[PDB]
Amino acid sequence: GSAPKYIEHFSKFSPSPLSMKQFLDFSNACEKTSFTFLRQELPVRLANIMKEINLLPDRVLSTPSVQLVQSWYVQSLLDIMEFLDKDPEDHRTLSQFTDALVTIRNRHNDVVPTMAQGVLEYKDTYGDDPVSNQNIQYFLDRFYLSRISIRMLINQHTLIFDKHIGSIDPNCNVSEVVKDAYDMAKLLCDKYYMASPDLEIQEINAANSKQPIHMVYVPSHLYHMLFELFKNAMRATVESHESSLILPPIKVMVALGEEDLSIKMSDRGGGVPLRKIERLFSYMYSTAPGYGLPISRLYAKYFQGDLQLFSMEGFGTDAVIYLKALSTDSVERLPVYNKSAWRHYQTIQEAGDWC
Amino acid sequence: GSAPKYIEHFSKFSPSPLSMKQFLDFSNACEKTSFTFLRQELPVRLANIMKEINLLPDRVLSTPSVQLVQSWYVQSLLDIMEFLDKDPEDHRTLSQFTDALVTIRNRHNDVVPTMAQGVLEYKDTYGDDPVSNQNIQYFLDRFYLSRISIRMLINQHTLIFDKHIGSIDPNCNVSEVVKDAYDMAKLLCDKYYMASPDLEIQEINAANSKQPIHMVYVPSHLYHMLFELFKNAMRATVESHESSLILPPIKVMVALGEEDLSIKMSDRGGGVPLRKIERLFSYMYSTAPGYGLPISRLYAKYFQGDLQLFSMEGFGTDAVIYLKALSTDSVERLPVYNKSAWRHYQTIQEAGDWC
Ligand SMILES: C[C@@H]1CN(C(=O)[C@@](C)(O)C(F)(F)F)[C@@H](C)CN1C(=O)c1ccc(C#N)cc1
Ligand SMILES: C[C@@H]1CN(C(=O)[C@@](C)(O)C(F)(F)F)[C@@H](C)CN1C(=O)c1ccc(C#N)cc1
Numbered sequence A, B: 001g002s003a004p005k006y007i008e009h010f011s012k013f014s015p016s017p018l019s020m021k022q023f024l025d026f027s028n029a030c031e032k033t034s035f036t037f038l039r040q041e042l043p044v045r046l047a048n049i050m051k052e053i054n055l056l057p058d059r060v061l062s063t064p065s066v067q068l069v070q071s072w073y074v075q076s077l078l079d080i081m082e083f084l085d086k087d088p089e090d091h092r093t094l095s096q097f098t099d100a101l102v103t104i105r106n107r108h109n110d111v112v113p114t115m116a117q118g119v120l121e122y123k124d125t126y127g128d129d130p131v132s133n134q135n136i137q138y139f140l141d142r143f144y145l146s147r148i149s150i151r152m153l154i155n156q157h158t159l160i161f162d163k164h165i166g167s168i169d170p171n172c173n174v175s176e177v178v179k180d181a182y183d184m185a186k187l188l189c190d191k192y193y194m195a196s197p198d199l200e201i202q203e204i205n206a207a208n209s210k211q212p213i214h215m216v217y218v219p220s221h222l223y224h225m226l227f228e229l230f231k232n233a234m235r236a237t238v239e240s241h242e243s244s245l246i247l248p249p250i251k252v253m254v255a256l257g258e259e260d261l262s263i264k265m266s267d268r269g270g271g272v273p274l275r276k277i278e279r280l281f282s283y284m285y286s287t288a289p290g291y292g293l294p295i296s297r298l299y300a301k302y303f304q305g306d307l308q309l310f311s312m313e314g315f316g317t318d319a320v321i322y323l324k325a326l327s328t329d330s331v332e333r334l335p336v337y338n339k340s341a342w343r344h345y346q347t348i349q350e351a352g353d354w355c
Helices: A003-010 A020-025 A031-053 A064-084 A095-107 A111-126 A130-160 A174-193 A219-240 A274-280 A292-302 A339-345 B003-010 B020-025 B031-053 B064-084 B095-107 B111-126 B130-160 B174-193 B219-240 B274-280 B292-302 B339-345
Strands: A169-173 A199-205 A214-217 A250-256 A260-270 A306-312 A315-324 B169-173 B199-205 B214-217 B250-256 B260-270 B306-312 B315-324
Touching (some): A003 A031, A003 A064, A031 A130, A064 A111, A130 A292, A130 A339, A169 A174, A169 A219, A174 A250, A174 A260, A214 A219, A260 B306, A292 A315, A306 B260, A306 B306, B031 B064, B064 B095, B130 B292, B130 B339, B169 B174, B174 B199, B174 B250, B214 B219, B219 B250, B219 B292, B292 B306
Parallel strands (some): A199 A250
Antiparallel strands (some): A260 A315, A306 A315, B260 B315
């Protein structure tokens, strides 16, 4: 019965944002060195997000969803406390940990669908107004980024201690990951629509005209973003041309500049009105009766990147993923609990500044 | 010595956002009808913006710039009070007005450069930090939109009472306005660089495949936005290819959908890092030792549109202007003084929610 205490403790610490090069330095660059680090970091990260939840309307708190996941974190937090007084050296004290991590990871595997359920519960229970949308948007963005960062650490440890350093590829060939996400989307598009647009890729390596474009990144993260975009671009190109015979291709450009590595995906799927675009990244409005876009964007932001959309109604849409080109600039984007984060939930909107 | 009083009065009223079709209904759809309207509207709009200024740091208030323009509005407000007790019918009582408008318009002709001077005064006097940037951004956006809306009314009256209804073209051929802004930028580009990229235009009239794209809009407003973008796209295409012989063209696409009319301008001028883009629309950071972009965007927003940028470092930049396709949806976007607008100036930032 000391959960509130632990959370009060570790909640006082700020999480330590790691860079992608520090990740590259790490089989056996001492997991002892990691164990001791993860012993404090995970609890600090779990506690900060747990501390922020506890401070949202009891209307949201009392729902089975929020309390279900809120109880998952409480258990994961306790699940790792065990090792605070333990001593490494014991080749079994740190394997008790790797297992303790794999067990915590799977315990949270369905947090996204679970949390989406809460959004729906809220829409039908309290309505879908801007202030609700705003608070949910603010919180889910932080909650999910928090989750992404925790899973990153866990995957890095579990994978490294069972060319690639954990889930990191130091020579990630962006165009290859583009092709992979494409092939997968194509296969699904073919089954469901029995027709699919082709793919054209083009690279622009500013500094080195023909050297293939490589970067240090987490391929699975990039695959996720690209796959989500290919699906939308495919669904729209197919559906908007159901009476046309032509079927334009989806074009992708990978450009590498001094500090940015950009990927643009252009489709001619009809486009979307500016007003609806703004709603495409909102958890509340994109819920019924998925969260590919809002979450794909958190993956972009996690390492200081971004994901943006801009279409032309009546023509098509461009989706662009901005990633940092240098591993030096690829530092975790983490949400922290402060007096600053507190007042973002004090939105008392009623009659704006514009008419 | 009653300025504070008048401002306290009219400041209680909210400005009346007009649609572009109401503008189309109006030589002599009775300027009496307008005179009486503008008699209350202008004072209400002048007072609301004047009321918001009076409530910004005295550090900003005391500068010659802010007080210089603050005294211009005070005089324009009084300049129109005169007609509050007047009676139309008198064919000279309303010409005293048209002149009173032309005189007020010119009195404010240099408010932009004047206000930009204040920004610089502030940068050097108090520094250029995010909270300063934010408050200036918030206020200048509103101040300038307020100004744009006031000049719109004035121009509509003065022009209509000296095919087009004032400054409104009910059959504005977007592609023609594109060509015009281009020719002008080209001429300047040719003088200064003695080389300039060509232009390709393409239309996508979704509903009517080949009918030229026309819309009801204020051509001079659209010309302003396009000219500003062509200049930047030209400067960058030329400068980034000073050692290349090839010189790609600037491509523009005009797409007309059910509710949106979009114009995209794509250049291959090298592109800009994501981090600097965010700073391109900031009055503070774009000041030295112009305001084409931040202001061009207010012109887009004035009638519910927008202006966005997205480039690929090492390749080029896309700039897109979103306008409403229907005159029904083209309603003035006006800033209003409320308890809502008040708290946007209570930014006490110090240590954010992210680490
Ligand atoms: C041991 C820590 C964490 N780490 C790891 O690779 C992992 C696999 O253990 C994990 F992904 F799980 F984090 C490197 C960034 C090196 N590293 C550090 O450089 C470090 C960072 C901050 C502190 C502190 N305080 C101490 C060490
Ligand atoms: C007379 C007003 C203003 N107006 C004008 O065209 C102008 C030229 O006078 C100006 F641009 F300067 F505004 C139309 C939108 C018609 N109109 C209205 O439809 C109207 C709108 C609101 C109210 C009110 N309250 C009364 C009339």
